[model samples]
Target: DLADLFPGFGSEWINTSSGRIFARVGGDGPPLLLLHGFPQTHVMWHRVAPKLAERFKVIVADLPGYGWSDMPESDEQHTPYTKRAMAKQLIEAMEQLGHVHFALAGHDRGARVSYRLALDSPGRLSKLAVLDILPTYEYWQRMNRAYALKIYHWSFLAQPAPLPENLLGGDPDFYVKAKLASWTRAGDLSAFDPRAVEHYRIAFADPMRRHVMCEDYRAGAYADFEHDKIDVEAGNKIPVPMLALWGASGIAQSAATPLDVWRKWASDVQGAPIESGHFLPEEAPDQTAEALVRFFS
Candidate 1:
């Protein structure tokens, strides 16, 4: 168990409409929902959650298909994998926990969900923070040769059906390690805690979770993209203020200015780059925590 990573945190199994979510709840003040990225679980926030929890109630949860959370079944349209559906589930989960509104911070894939929630629900979140990612529409529209190569997994995992699942399932241990290493500024796993790394490796070793992850990308390629396209075309912007933090050497910089792109989707956007890589919360937790505390305050 990687439970020790979060010393004072209490684990909770939250039953939502979509599926069961595994979350770590700690501290007390204004509630803050922390969402993790792909291939990794809420363990990504282990380092930063405690500090943030000192001033705000922190809830770090495994996304639907990752870690201990349920690997929900999907339909032909991959409806359950859409960010909109994911956000709706979280909103209901939060309400059940007695929080009608709360602050939110998401990294990588979770960032996609946070922004979608802010736009779709409009007032369910007091503040929204996106870490190390661009919007689905922006990422798709700007997928050039270099970017496509840098983020090849987007297309690779989004491929039809059992292809990605079967391939990734072959050696999930290597797959997870390769991803976490290559995406970091150090080009290694030095930024991660060994225990947390083990959790990721084990979680991905499950074939069903592997398939759900692939479906998540398929959602990104189709459903997620369509939702984003509609919002962007209609001149819709995230109604809440937004905070964006990307690793200085993260793929976010592989595209245009993050703040500029975020401004297109949010009315008020502010952030800067941390001296790390794609996994900001892990590679640069102190700075990441500081930024969130400042933004949400």
Candidate 2:
């Protein structure tokens, strides 16, 4: 599947102390680790990574529990799926790949993990970029009726186990398709490659994967939120230069100012809105890739 999406990339499993990570590595330059968001896998980077590999060592990985990566059993506290745990495993995966320091870019859920990585392991990151997301704590603090209505999953998926899982299991394909369609600007799935769509369909169709997705959201609401609050109260910020890219018509635009919100969590921050929706990488790959190349250069 990766070979189909990424022609020159080599796929493998990198073992970490916690679990194994499914990753695709290609190109030959400075290392740049790309993290995918929710409802998607490392395949989400297909449109942008090969091009980036020309100038950077592009490593795209399925976040722990999201794709081919190992899904650790979820605990009552949701610690296993927390961004803290995810970030730790990802860093170990990179270190095992022989990258002590690397540039990092993430989308949606992956962006949250990237933020945690920058906070918990600042010394190991060269630069950081988040696509189409503000921090989780910010989202929780600023949640309003509009957000609640538009982004219903934040609460729905975070509900007690088996509830969200059972509901999603009823018609997994329809739910996934509807969510993807709604998040895009045109409210359709035209932006996604058919193969990528199929890949996502396969990933979410698995019952266990659906529960892991729920646990990820649960961690976002609880453990991840508390970690963010502690960081904010202690004035901990991302030490590296950070870039925040969002879709002009994406869900984040309805929230607080993206850059200003990021400033609260990082030091030097700069980026502008892309001409797309929630799935910037897929909807506007050229623009997204160009921005990343410039920022991480």
Candidate 3:
């Protein structure tokens, strides 16, 4: 029972050759795309997008399986869920809106796709801002006892099919809420709006979406890692101007140094902690929105 989070904006279902993507678009000026991460959808931008739309054309989208978007079957290779594949549809979505090139800000899993697209199609992105994520290759290579413990979900959700799915499906409410709270600076749900929380809860409650959610992590473990490995091995760095923002006490902070790690993957990287937790968009929306506007502008 939440009212319209994005008051003036309208929703559109972008049908790509791969699948149908649900998005909300509004505002004017240069095009900008905002992508949300795991366990959430476009509504994650409720506090920020309206403001962003005041200055730039803003489009917020569900990365295929997370919201009302299509949940295509996953293959044994887990190729469909790869950041490369995910990024492709986003480009198509943007192009469909007549934005052959645009600026982007993505959080978590969406950040993964942002960088992937920036790398795969460097010319398409005018600027890139990633929230709370590291290169997939670095994540796999740097996992130790402490880091592993911090990001247990990356491994937990990556487990072989239906195990994590069945387990998460059993009592999704607690699991979803608990996971959301655990990554916050306060380690509670106070930062998130109840309306957004309800949407996230619904995303996890459905077993089909729940299974594809696992498939996301599964692709993260395999195909996603391989792609990043190749990029890292090749000395390929994202050429776009990039901003990397993380929560002061969020998951990405567990790394040795987030900026130091990012420097290895992008030539021009600038960002700092947002004085919040992992979900910067929700935990620190004002700061998150401003930082992105400053960077993208």
Candidate 4:
């Protein structure tokens, strides 16, 4: 079921105003682009992409330094691959590679980029999907005692300087696994594949990768919120059909809070929680794939 969008799904170097990004591509049809979350690579879509590729073209890529991609050289402003910058770089990469119009679905860090893409380049995206996130503003505004503790890393990573990265750099794998363990439902770890977990470990070992991860959160705290506030004030809607999926047993759950919030940004939007934790794809691949196919198709 792995639709080989490119027989030669090799690394393609893309130049951004900031620096260069190494990306991976696969599948074929109407160019559906997929973005992966933190500490993981383009491989995150290994199971899901093949299913969507059955109908539309699928391109799954590592964001900048994550996965099997080249790191931007040092001295280059330690570009943390902020969602806004990442989205711009990704779009430029797609256009240069001849995919001007495409559908987008992003998980975690990727989902952050998708949000910016909707705001920055609304016309190029035919449809959009955001997995496991609230509009940056909604999340900050709605934080209660319950969530604040669960999302502890948010404020921790937002700290200035080496405090965040220095601690994570000690044993990046431990850091990655610790976060994963906290978010997952109890007993789900038995189903966790060690090999799959290792993928995240290696990606975060690199200092640049760690820096980008930290910056992503920093931007979420500082810039992304302002961006969302501006858009909300301007009354700009996503203007495309948006399908948002969160995990019922995961951090993003709400009786219907997320769906209600999304409707304000997109004229047409639909979503519901599935039986899963933070990692929806891995937690419930069949249901996730089916839901995506039904919505995106």
Candidate 5:
């Protein structure tokens, strides 16, 4: 059932010290790594990855603990799920794929990993692009009532593990569907392919996966934020060029200008708004693909 979602891509299970990564690789040209966001898997790129493949080799993979990727046990500090750890897993996966260096693009949660990878290992990434999110530290710094109401899950999901795990596991489908519906510009799930929606539903329905998702948010809230702050205070900058893409019609616009936020962290930054909501690759695949191709080129 899952293989049907990726028409021509060949599947591979890659093992690294972090965990096993499930990825689909195909196409020919320079390598491009595509990572997905929360509550979904690599299939989130179903609409945009193939088109990107026409110009560059596309490797779409799930973050560890999401999709079929192996989830290691949770640590007290949540280090295993931190964006830094996630970034390492991705980098190892890329190296295993024979890419010493490549362009990287990520949507939502994946975007967090992409930027972290670029920051930690500057020369490894030729170009970096992130979709629909501001820096993790900035987002927490700017959190307010209106922003909280719009993205309460950032807090709710970050609460201690079992709390969120038990609640979300109650009716995973309802929670997943509700989130997918709420975040989009139209306030509906019409933009996602039915096949992809079902895949997310099934993945989110599992208790372990649900806990892993909460761990990710927890890591984002505490561990990831500290990492970013350290870098910022030390005057560390992303040595690689970056492209920031945001949904003109989504919740991110309500927060701050995407490029404005990214410019502070990256020395060379460029971006524009895509006419969609939180899910750029799915809601505005054509424009997303065009922006990524141009930026990565």
Candidate 6:
């Protein structure tokens, strides 16, 4: 079904109470689920998913309200955007699809979902990778100028009803595209690629799309924060082999918690600096894929 977007790939649908998720499975051996972040559908994996599919059972699915999936019915129900909720949804969806145990790798928003997945269902994830983001609790406690500016969406869209949602709804395309485009400078714009950026355009231009994005941000402020706090108070960690890859140009927690935070949660934790911007898979596919191959192996 995804021949054009992902040739040689095959898929199945796992209908859960929240919504049905479209999952693509390929290759043989151990299972690995690939989750894409906001403003980009499964298409964000276009450059890298196929390469990994050759070695493992690579699965790619769109987040609810993004890509080809269903959107939230109303703005108030946006709490479904919480990372923990999405993690639970994915766990059920994947299990229903016959994967009792699996590994996962998620980019940006997806990575946040993976974090919650590991926390909520430790046994399912044998190994995990979170690309280009830190936990929101950690981020909020230690935010700085560069980070605040780079991830402004955390504050901008996260605002409650009629303000952010209404304002962004005014012209979701321009709002989302302008925000995405700000990720790069003029000369670097070519490297970001308009074709790739177009995916963000389509994802955000729709009203349903805008609502989901806001929910994710709202969760970042409310549910996600509370969940992480509870986990910390209980001294809980993911308890798996974990790898955290971030862009060299991105947040340097060196002054704050830094890479050491992973050690508190994961039994075997490691992180490295990679050449890229915030979008690791798209910005640096070869290096990112090489890292995943080495880590998952």
RMSD (Å) per prediction: 0.9, 1.1, 0.9, 3.4, 1.0, 2.6
Q: For model 5, how does the per-residue alpha-carbon lDDT over 1-297 read when each residue is reduced to its tens digit? A: 654677889898999888999988888899999999988999999888888888899999989899999998889988878999999988888888899899999888899988888889988898989898887898888899988887899999999868988888778899999988878888899999999999899999889899999999999999999999998889888979888899988766788887887888999988899889899988988999899988877
For residues 1-297, write the lDDT of model 3, one tens digit per residue.
645689899899998878899998899989999999888888999999988998999999998777988877788977768889999988997888889999999999899999999999999999999999888888889899988988888899999987898788779999989989999989899999998999899888889888887899999999999999988899999999999998888878787689999999999999788898899988999999899888888
- Model 3, 155: alpha-carbon shift in Å? 1.2
Q: Is candidate 1 or candidate 6 better by lDDT?
A: 1
lDDT per residue as tens, model 6, 170-272? 7777766665545432324455546656766777777767777778888888788899889877988878789988877544333244467667666678998
- Higher-TM-score candidate of 2 and 6: 2
Clashes of 2: 0
Predicted candidate 1 versus true structure: per-residue lDDT over 1-297, tens digit per residue: 544689989998999988898999999999999999887999999999999989999999888877888877998878888999999988888888998989999999899999999999978999999999999999999999999998999999999998988888778899989999999999999999999998888888888888888889999999999999999999999879889999888978788888889988888889788999899999998999999999988
Alpha-carbon runs more than 4 Å astray in model 4? 1-11, 70-80, 254-256
Q: After superposition, how far is residue 275 of candidate 1 from its true place, in Å?
A: 1.1
For residues 1-297, what per-residue lDDT tens digits would candidate 2 score against the true structure? 433698889987999887899998999999999999889999989999988999999999999998899888888998878999999999999989899999999999999999998999898899999999988898888888988887889999999989999989989999888888888888999999999998899899999999999999999999999999999989998888989999998877778889888888888899799999999999999999999999989
Poorest lDDT segment (10 consecutive residues) of candidate 2: 1-10
The per-prediction tally of clashing pairs is 0, 0, 0, 2, 0, 0
| TM-score versus the correct structure, for each prediction | 0.98, 0.98, 0.98, 0.89, 0.98, 0.90
lDDT by candidate, in order shown: 0.91, 0.91, 0.89, 0.74, 0.88, 0.76
Residue 236 error, candidate 1, Å: 0.5
lDDT of 4 by residue, 1-297 (tens): 223333445556766655565665555678888888865777666667778777877777778657655555422333445566778878887887788888898887788789789888888798898888778777777767767777878788878766898898878877777776766666335434565666677777778778777777777787877888888889988887889998877766642367888888889889978888777777777888888888877
Model 2's C-alpha root-mean-square deviation from the true structure amounts to: 1.1
Model 3: weakest 10-residue lDDT segment is 1-10
Winner on lDDT (2 vs 4): 2
Candidate 2 has which clashing residue pairs, if any? none
